[PDB]
Amino acid sequence: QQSTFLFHDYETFGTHPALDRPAQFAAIRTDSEFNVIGEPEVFYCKPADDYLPQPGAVLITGITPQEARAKGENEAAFAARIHSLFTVPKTCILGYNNVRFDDEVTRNIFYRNFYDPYAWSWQHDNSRWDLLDVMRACYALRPEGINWPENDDGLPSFRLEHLTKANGIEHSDAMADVYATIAMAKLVKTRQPRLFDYLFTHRNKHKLMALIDVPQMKPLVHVSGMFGAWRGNTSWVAPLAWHPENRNAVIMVDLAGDISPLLELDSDTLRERLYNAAVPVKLVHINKCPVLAQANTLRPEDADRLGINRQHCLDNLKILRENPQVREKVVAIFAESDNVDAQLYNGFFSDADRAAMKIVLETEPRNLPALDITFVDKRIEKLLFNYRARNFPGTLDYAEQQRWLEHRRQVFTPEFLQGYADELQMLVQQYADDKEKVALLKALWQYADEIV
Numbered sequence: 001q002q003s004t005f006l007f008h009d010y011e012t013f014g015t016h017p018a019l020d021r022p023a024q025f026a027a028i029r030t031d032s033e034f035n036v037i038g039e040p041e042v043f044y045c046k047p048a049d050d051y052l053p054q055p056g057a058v059l060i061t062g063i064t065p066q067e068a069r070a071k072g073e074n075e076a077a078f079a080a081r082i083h084s085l086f087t088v089p090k091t092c093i094l095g096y097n098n099v100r101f102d103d104e105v106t107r108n109i110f111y112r113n114f115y116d117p118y119a120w121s122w123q124h125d126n127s128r129w130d131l132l133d134v135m136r137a138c139y140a141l142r143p144e145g146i147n148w149p150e151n152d153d154g155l156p157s158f159r160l161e162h163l164t165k166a167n168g169i170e171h172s173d174a175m176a177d178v179y180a181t182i183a184m185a186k187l188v189k190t191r192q193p194r195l196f197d198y199l200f201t202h203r204n205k206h207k208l209m210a211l212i213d214v215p216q217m218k219p220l221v222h223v224s225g226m227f228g229a230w231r232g233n234t235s236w237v238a239p240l241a242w243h244p245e246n247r248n249a250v251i252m253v254d255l256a257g258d259i260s261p262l263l264e265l266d267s268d269t270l271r272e273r274l275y276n277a278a279v280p281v282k283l284v285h286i287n288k289c290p291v292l293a294q295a296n297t298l299r300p301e302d303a304d305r306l307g308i309n310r311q312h313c314l315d316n317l318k319i320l321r322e323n324p325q326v327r328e329k330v331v332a333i334f335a336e337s338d339n340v341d342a343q344l345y346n347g348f349f350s351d352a353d354r355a356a357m358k359i360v361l362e363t364e365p366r367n368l369p370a371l372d373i374t375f376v377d378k379r380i381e382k383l384l385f386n387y388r389a390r391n392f393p394g395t396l397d398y399a400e401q402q403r404w405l406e407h408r409r410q411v412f413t414p415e416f417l418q419g420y421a422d423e424l425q426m427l428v429q430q431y432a433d434d435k436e437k438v439a440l441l442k443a444l445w446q447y448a449d450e451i452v
């Protein structure tokens with residue numbers, strides 16, 4: 001079996017990866033050298049009748065709820081198709097902003113439809129990557145040979161459409177974003193070969209672990225969206241401690257920051273603060289392909305370009321090393337909704353509960369009503385009801401139908417429905433000169449009228 005890349009992208013009906021619903025999934029498989037070896041995989045997800053899309057999302061995607069409903073399969077089948085692609089052995093699953101967005105959509109789709117939300121990304125030698133932080137790393141660390149567009153605010157832009165246009169890459173077609181992401185990968189591989197190889201290799205958590213030296217507070221360069229485009233998303237950081245609960249999270253200090261709150265304030269004040277002096281502390285999640293490298297990877301000329309003050313960072317590093325009591329202080333900081341759709345991270349399920357959920361998954365939907373099985377975790381009863389009612393409404397008995405009707409009633413409150421009508425009317429005035437958007441908004445009104 002050969003190593004492959006699976007490039008993918010979602011179009012969704014809103015910004016919330018848990019509370020909004022997916023509309024469309026697109027993917028294609030390449031070999032290890034980015035040669036396309038698969039057929040385009042494009043399919044839609046039917047939205048259940050307890051949901052209205054965010055109008056803004058539909059204006060961006062151009063996909064109406066009517067179209068996803070008419071072309072889609074139920075979310076159970078949508079999940080099955082995605083799971084089948086993602087679990088082919090030796091697959092690197094990647095996209096553009098997938099770590100923060102698409103992967104969270106995936107986890108939630110799997111969660112709602114009785115798949116393991118996590119196993120897909122690591123089992124059978126699988127992995128994840130994300131070209132967004134690769135582009136950011138290039139801009140900060142090795143900008144030579146790539147054109148770096150500025151947005152309307154005068155800051156470097158990493159929007160996929162800006163980067164393609166700025167570098168002469170054809171960008172238009174449900175597959176447009178996927179092909180654009182492949183082109184980004186080829187771009188960096190060709191123009192910054194050693195950085196590309198370094199970043200690919202260091203997608204693996206164990207390679208990242210080797211860079212981390214807590215006793216020595218060994219400084220690293222870290223490229224992260226959280227740092228801000230104004231400094232090329234980059235700083236020098238040092239590891240203080242590992243997270244008390246989260247096995248994959250290390251606690252970093254931003255050496256370019258103001259460490260005085262860490263020196264002066266107690267752990268209780270600092271916990272309230274990061275939830276007035278800024279607390280220069282962040283978590284780095286080693287399972288989320290963070291960009292980390294030895295400190296000298298950021299060259300002086302580039303530190304100067306990004307406005308990063310080396311002496312300030314060195315002074316802070318010296319102070320922190322002479323005050324190891326700050327380690328316990330940050331550990332103490334991190335020592336620390338009734339909608340089941342929002343409860344993915346309310347904990348892991350027991351081995352027994354997962355085994356039972358696996359039976360739900362592998363049982364014929366028609367045999368679910370009579371399915372004898374036991375759950376402990378309180379989420380599962382509601383997950384199972386929603387699953388059946390949304391995907392297989394023809395299998396509900398009268399009491400279950402009445403339960404679903406009440407559920408819908410509690411979503412479509414008086415405040416929600418008025419707000420929705422108000423937003424559509426506002427948007428049709430705002431975008432009156434845009435004929436495509438006007439037509440989409442009329443479609444949204446018509447869908448809302450039906451789904452009520």
Ligand SMILES: COc1ccc(Nc2cc(C(F)(F)F)ccc2Cl)c(C(=O)O)c1
Pocket residue numbers: 218219236237255294295296310311312313314317
């Ligand atoms: C013994 O502790 C140190 C101290 C400084 C180091 N390097 C370094 C440190 C910084 C810092 F300013 F961020 F601290 C910037 C750039 C570099 Cl190359 C390094 C290092 O690069 O390994 C180790």
Ligand SMILES: [Mg+2]
Pocket residue numbers: 009010096097177
């Ligand atoms: Mg996307």
